[PDB]
Amino acid sequence: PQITLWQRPLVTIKIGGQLKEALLDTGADDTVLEEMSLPGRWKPKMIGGIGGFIKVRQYDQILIEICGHKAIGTVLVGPTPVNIIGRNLLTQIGCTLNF
Amino acid sequence: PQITLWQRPLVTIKIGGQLKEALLDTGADDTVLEEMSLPGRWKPKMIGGIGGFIKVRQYDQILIEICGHKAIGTVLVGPTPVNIIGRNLLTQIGCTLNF
Ligand SMILES: C[C@H]1CC[C@@H](O)[C@H]1NC(=O)[C@H](Cc1ccccc1)C[C@H](O)CN1CCN(C(=O)CCc2cccnc2)C[C@H]1C(=O)NC(C)(C)C
């Protein structure tokens, strides 16, 4: 797909059999999802955004289908404004910027 | 050009004679730059993100040169850790997300 940026790039993702809206964020290194229950253990992470740092929990090897494209990688759960898809998953689905 | 997301999408921009390094961010609605002097009148704005809100100065109708391409728009100047080129100017250079 080709997505223009006139509007906010919100796509539908499927995680844990659920559907959610997520932001295709190229300026985000990591994928950060809203507070939810993921399986397995979690390690601690401190990520910094525009207003400083927050603490998140990292889950490894989570299957997440972004627009009919499967991806298995690291997902961070924490107090984020919206669900964010970062470069770690954007590269898995073959996402690039063109101009 | 086609920019892959293995690395951070950084590019050189020219604003007011100064050449700066900026990150192409599809997750950002606005364009925010590190503290600097821009001519004209400004308006205090409060923008939020991961970590919270920061107070920025809003300058309208500012010209920026993103990889040779010129773009005219509103740029916020404040205490940001990275120079962000948001959707408002991304659309101007015909920036698109493909996968
Ligand atoms: C994702 C993190 C993981 C690790 C870092 O990679 C990190 N990246 C980022 O945070 C980068 C900046 C950065 C990159 C590299 C080094 C340091 C900092 C910004 C992010 O891509 C854009 N971001 C998405 C979430 N946002 C929203 O949903 C807004 C919703 C909303 C609701 C109500 C009121 N206001 C806003 C805020 C928005 C943002 O920042 N927008 C502005 C205008 C402020 C720039």
Side-chain angles (χ1 to χ4, degrees):
Chain A
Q2 177 173 91
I3 307 170
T4 46
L5 309 169
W6 299 98
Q7 300 270 278
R8 217 173 285 193
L10 305 175
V11 297
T12 309
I13 59 171
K14 185 159 81 165
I15 189 167
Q18 306 182 272
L19 288 185
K20 287 96 163 288
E21 290 280 286
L23 185 69
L24 296 187
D25 212 330
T26 57
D29 305 294
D30 311 291
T31 296
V32 183
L33 270 77
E34 288 171 40
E35 180 55 52
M36 64 178 288
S37 301
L38 282 176
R41 300 198 122 233
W42 59 270
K43 263 66 197 175
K45 238 273 183 69
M46 281 267 280
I47 54 177
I50 212 60
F53 295 74
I54 59 166
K55 265 294 198 181
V56 293
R57 299 178 270 128
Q58 82 168 71
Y59 289 86
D60 293 326
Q61 278 190 51
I62 299 297
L63 184 273
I64 170 173
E65 188 220 275
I66 323 165
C67 261
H69 300 265
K70 278 181 169 183
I72 308 166
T74 297
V75 172
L76 307 172
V77 178
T80 179
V82 301
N83 288 307
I84 294 170
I85 301 294
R87 299 186 297 107
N88 71 112
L89 290 188
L90 292 177
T91 44
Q92 294 199 15
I93 64 184
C95 213
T96 57
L97 283 173
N98 304 273
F99 63 101
Chain B
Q2 184 168 72
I3 301 181
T4 43
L5 281 347
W6 287 114
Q7 290 101 52
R8 280 185 169 183
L10 297 161
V11 291
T12 310
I13 64 165
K14 193 226 91 278
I15 176 171
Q18 294 161 80
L19 290 173
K20 288 179 178 292
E21 188 173 68
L23 183 72
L24 303 166
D25 189 3
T26 59
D29 294 343
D30 311 90
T31 292
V32 197
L33 294 166
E34 293 164 14
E35 280 280 312
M36 72 189 279
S37 234
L38 278 179
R41 269 100 287 264
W42 53 270
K43 277 78 62 241
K45 194 183 170 63
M46 199 77 73
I47 49 156
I50 295 293
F53 288 70
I54 62 160
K55 200 237 115 207
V56 298
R57 282 175 290 155
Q58 170 189 209
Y59 289 98
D60 290 313
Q61 303 186 128
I62 305 288
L63 174 276
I64 291 189
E65 291 208 57
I66 316 178
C67 284
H69 301 69
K70 297 194 176 200
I72 288 169
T74 302
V75 309
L76 316 173
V77 186
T80 181
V82 187
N83 286 315
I84 302 294
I85 297 294
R87 289 190 301 107
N88 64 311
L89 304 189
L90 282 186
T91 52
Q92 303 304 96
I93 66 183
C95 199
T96 206
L97 199 58
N98 287 94
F99 69 87

